[PDB]
Design a protein around this ligand. Structure first.
Ligand SMILES: *Cc1c(COP(=O)(O)O)cnc(C)c1O
Ligand SMILES: *Cc1c(COP(=O)(O)O)cnc(C)c1O
Lengths: 358, 359
């Protein structure tokens, strides 16, 4: 009963449906990269057979989905990293982003038994992956002439600042996208969680929900998944392993970073940065013990967190702890720790047990 | 082109255990391999180190994973056991257990085990995390000496809170409490982890417990490195470039457009992000090696990708090797630049990274 991630399948199902309601003329790429944002790659795909496609960061992730029996299209959002992977991508029926000359040249040169669906990736201001506007027309035209590309060619981009509604970058990216796509056949996709929730004019043909599919807000404005009618999917849980007396004036943890002002009782939780809980968490960060809120005291260690229960607290070794979950949104922990909700949910280690419910 | 990969140098690990033996040549070694061996691989790290006298783990589950992989060496449960029903298993697996609370002691008192168990009584000397407080320790100790389920002698363990701070008199106060309690008791004594081993030779006693320094990473926050102490870095975190792209002066990069280029340049995109374990806290200017040479992170680290500034006519290509930390770039340098503990950097990696073992 130590560090466990409990994944609520009913919440997942709900969220995909709730997102369809917000984007009712758009198909869904369920984004499941990085072990489905910490929720389990294969189990998340298995929970969502109504998704129109799954979205992954890397070919290895797509192959893992196929290995576990997943048959729906998988979009390689970064494309492919070696020309020698094209026969697999063709045979496996993965759709691929194409963002550079190397990938384009490989598609021109290869002999494949079946052509492949492509999403040409346009750099519209993020400046990470993608073909730049001034190179994009010639690039696109070569893609349309490739016998190894199943026509028409689709067009994809991604917003850098969709979470800042009051700033002009999204509208700039959008106008670049729209200028490029004019008169072209091919499906259009630019919106992920932020686009879906705040930019209805960015929905087009396909949207790609990631963090909000897991019932977690993409914004850092205090909002939670529930503010958009999405239900939190993950709870990170554990157990007390000690309840101990502690006297006034006595420090706790490494570096003696917290000192009690009174006599009290401390709880020790079987959870640490070796499980994925941020070492950054300050004293005062909320944890739930038997469902009431108590503060972290002293530094988070690799395997343990101390909490302040109070001097006659009746909590005991064995009792349930919620790091985030029912009553304690991950976005609250994000705000209190200054750690992005994205990183909190995703950057867990393999030590955490995975449990699925409903 | 290789994706997010941890490369674990077995030769370095073996070197480190022997180095640590040279620094504390009268003490036995508990190799501390909790949290997937500080990111290096629980079972493979233990397989690399047959010379260790024991292996230390945080939780029973980790000890059972060692036995399941065929490690037969003594394993110490540093936090003891969380359920009384664990005792038969602990007994029959020959796991050594810390004991630090009443629940554990009463469980030992009313079990009837096939074989008695080796116990290390955990004393709170001032960390105030686990252990028995001094005013309860004599009575608690006596009860262990009278328990038929405990092999005699009862051994004695504690742990330093601030051993990385020599100008602090905290460590000395811990040692005075520890020595007072151990006076005239027959068991083995163990207080020192990496910081105690390196800086406090009067803390070595019968058994020392290297964690971080075993992996060639310094336990201190003063920009010292494992090599400061003659230890060799074990882990390299590596990847490859997936794109090299033109970029213009006045142009932003990444989410929030937090870095803006002052020149026309080329950027590199690495197959590495916080989805692999690389910290999202890394600021612009954090170093990475591309083809052996240092280049800076530009813009925020993403879940799967990191952007670096290569230069206006750089010849780096998609596919080229990238070192996040490793040869020519110690994890402690990343720790300094990101303001993250080196403990966290090496340990808080996800299952996405491949594990490769060399030498
Ligand atoms: C990660 C990602 C998404 C999903 O992002 P969220 O903000 O988590 O919804 C969509 N598109 C691309 C290209 C991505 O890399
Ligand atoms: C974590 C731990 C160690 C190892 O600590 P380092 O600072 O990594 O050497 C040793 N003993 C105990 C009880 C521990 O919890």
């Amino acid at each position: 009963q130590a560090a466990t991630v409990v994944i609520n399948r009913r919440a997942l199902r709900h969220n995909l449906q709730r997102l369809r309601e917000l984007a009712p003329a758009s198909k869904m790429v369920a984004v499941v990269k990085a072990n489905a944002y910490g929720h389990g790659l294969l189990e998340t795909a298995r929970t969502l057979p109504d998704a129109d496609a799954f979205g992954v960061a890397r070919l290895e992730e797509a192959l893992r989905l196929r290995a576990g029996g997943i048959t729906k299209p998988v979009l390689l959002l970064e494309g492919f990293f070696d020309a020698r992977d094209l026969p697999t991508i063709s045979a496996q029926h993965f759709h691929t982003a194409v963002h550079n000359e190397e990938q384009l040249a490989a598609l021109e040169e290869a002999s494949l038994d079946e052509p492949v669906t492509v999403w040409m990736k346009l750099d519209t201001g993020m400046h990470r992956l993608g073909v730049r506007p001034e190179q994009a027309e010639a690039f696109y035209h070569r893609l349309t002439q490739c016998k190894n590309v199943r026509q028409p060619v689709n067009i994809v981009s991604h917003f850098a600042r969709a979470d800042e509604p009051k700033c002009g970058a999204t509208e700039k990216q959008l106008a670049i996208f729209n200028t490029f796509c004019e008169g072209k056949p091919g499906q259009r996709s630019i919106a992920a969680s932020g686009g879906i929730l705040l930019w209805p004019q960015s929905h087009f043909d396909w949207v790609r929900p990631g963090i909000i599919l897991y019932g977690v807000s993409p914004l850092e404005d205090r909002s939670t998944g529930a503010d958009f009618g999405c239900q939190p999917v993950m709870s990170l849980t554990s157990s007390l392993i000690a309840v101990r007396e502690h006297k006034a004036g006595e420090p706790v943890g490494y570096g003696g970073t917290w000192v009690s002002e009174r006599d009290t009782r401390l709880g020790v939780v079987a959870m640490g940065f070796g499980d994925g809980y941020p070492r950054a968490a300050p004293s005062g960060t909320p944890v739930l013990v038997n469902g009431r809120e108590v503060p972290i005291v002293g530094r988070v260690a690799m395997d343990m967190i101390c909490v302040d229960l109070g001097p006659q607290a009746q909590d005991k070794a064995g009792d349930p702890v919620i790091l985030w979950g029912e009553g304690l949104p991950v976005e609250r922990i994000a705000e209190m720790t200054k750690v992005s909700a994205y990183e909190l949910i995703t950057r867990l280690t393999s030590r955490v047990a995975m449990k699925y419910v409903d």
